[PDB]
Paper text:
Here, we demonstrate that one such protease toxin from Escherichia coli, Cpe1, disrupts DNA replication and chromosome segregation by cleaving conserved sequences within the ATPase domain of type II DNA topoisomerases GyrB and ParE. The defining feature of this protease family is a conserved catalytic triad, consisting of a cysteine (Cys) thiol group, a histidine (His) imidazolium ring, and a third residue—either aspartate (Asp) or asparagine (Asn)—that orients and activates the imidazolium ring for peptide bond hydrolysis. Therefore, bacteria encode specific immunity proteins adjacent to their cognate toxin genes to prevent self-intoxication or harm to kin cells.
To circumvent this limitation, we co-purified Cpe1tox with its cognate immunity protein, Cpi1, which allowed us to obtain well-diffracting crystals. Using selenomethionine-substituted protein, we determined the crystal structure of the Cpe1tox–Cpi1 complex at a resolution of 1.87 Å. In our crystal structure, Cpe1 features a six-stranded antiparallel β-sheet flanked by five α-helices on either side, forming the typical α/β core that is characteristic of the PLCP family. The catalytic triad—Cys, His, Asp—is clearly evident and aligns with prior functional predictions. Despite sharing limited sequence identity with ABC transporter-associated proteases, a structural homology search using the DALI server identified ComA (Z-score = 16.3; RMSD of 1.9 Å across 121 aligned Cα atoms) and LahT (Z-score = 15.9; RMSD of 1.8 Å across 117 aligned Cα atoms) as the closest homologs. Interestingly, although Cpi1 binds to Cpe1 and they share a large interface (1,050 Å2), our crystal structure reveals that Cpi1 does not sterically occlude the active site of Cpe1. Instead, Cpi1 primarily interacts with a shallow hydrophobic concave region on the surface of Cpe1 that is located adjacent to the catalytic pocket. However, when we mutated all four residues (Cpi1mut4), the resulting mutant lacked the ability to neutralize Cpe1 toxicity and failed to bind Cpe1 in vitro, despite being expressed at levels comparable to that of wild-type protein.
Residue numbers in the entry:
A (entry chain C): 2 to 96
B (entry chain A): 3 to 142
Write the structure that this text describes.
């Protein structure tokens, strides 16, 4: 394959709203901060995260660099929701 | 497509994708077919690759489809709803590949209908969980 330019993308924070189930994610994209939203969805014991349309587009663009990136984001999210202490920042993509 | 499978057979009941990106729409056609809705992959749109865009399109012909990143641990709860679509993304690939998860057999293996060649095969639950990137289209 060709060269895909590498990046450092970190997850800086996860803010979960117990009432609305909304989730605010703050990423660092090579130092530039950006906020994306999602909604937590537990239905018939299926533990899902409904990314916003723009978050899904963003994740799809970096999947070629790290196909595990939703597993990382999801793992952190469920730990946060369950009240575990999570040390941030958490690497999503590194060079 | 380098992931490990067994008992693979060509199966003309699996809908074969018509283009590289067509696997989402091919899965979408089979997902709707299982619910007595008959829409060709061309009408669904063989450019659709993201779970958001695929669930949104299925909800033009049906109702109640979700397109979410799902935990590995929800595999059996997903298959309890019927067939669902899983985005496979193996190491080194620059693209995802949608497959239809038909169910799980009695030994717990995952039964896959794959539109790449139009085949049916099995995967161990552990291997399936590693290659599936969590992105999923399903109808609770």
């Amino acid at each position: 394959g060709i060269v895909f330019t590498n990046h450092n993308i970190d997850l800086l924070s996860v803010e979960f709203d117990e009432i609305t189930k909304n989730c605010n994610y703050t990423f660092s994209v090579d130092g530039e901060t950006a906020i994306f939203t999602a909604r937590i969805s537990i239905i018939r014991n299926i533990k899902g995260i409904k990314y916003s349309e723009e978050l899904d587009k963003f994740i799809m663009s970096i999947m070629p660099l790290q196909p595990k990136v939703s597993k990382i984001l999801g793992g952190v999210t469920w730990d946060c929701i369950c009240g575990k202490e999570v040390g941030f920042p958490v690497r999503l993509i590194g060079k | 497509g380098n992931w490990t499978v067994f008992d693979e057979v060509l199966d003309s009941n699996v809908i074969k994708q018509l283009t590289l990106t067509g696997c989402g729409a091919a899965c979408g056609e089979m997902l709707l077919r299982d619910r007595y809705i008959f829409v060709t992959q061309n009408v669904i749109g063989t450019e659709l690759t993201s779970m958001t865009s695929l669930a949104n399109k299925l909800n033009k012909f049906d109702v109640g489809w979700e397109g979410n990143a799902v935990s590995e641990s929800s595999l059996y709860a997903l298959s309890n709803t019927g067939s669902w679509g899983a985005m496979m993304w193996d190491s080194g690939s620059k693209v995802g590949h949608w497959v239809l998860v038909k169910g799980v057999d009695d030994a717990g293996n995952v039964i896959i209908y794959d539109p790449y060649q139009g085949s049916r095969y099995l995967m161990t639950e552990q291997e399936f969980k590693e290659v599936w990137n969590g992105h999923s289209v399903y109808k609770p």
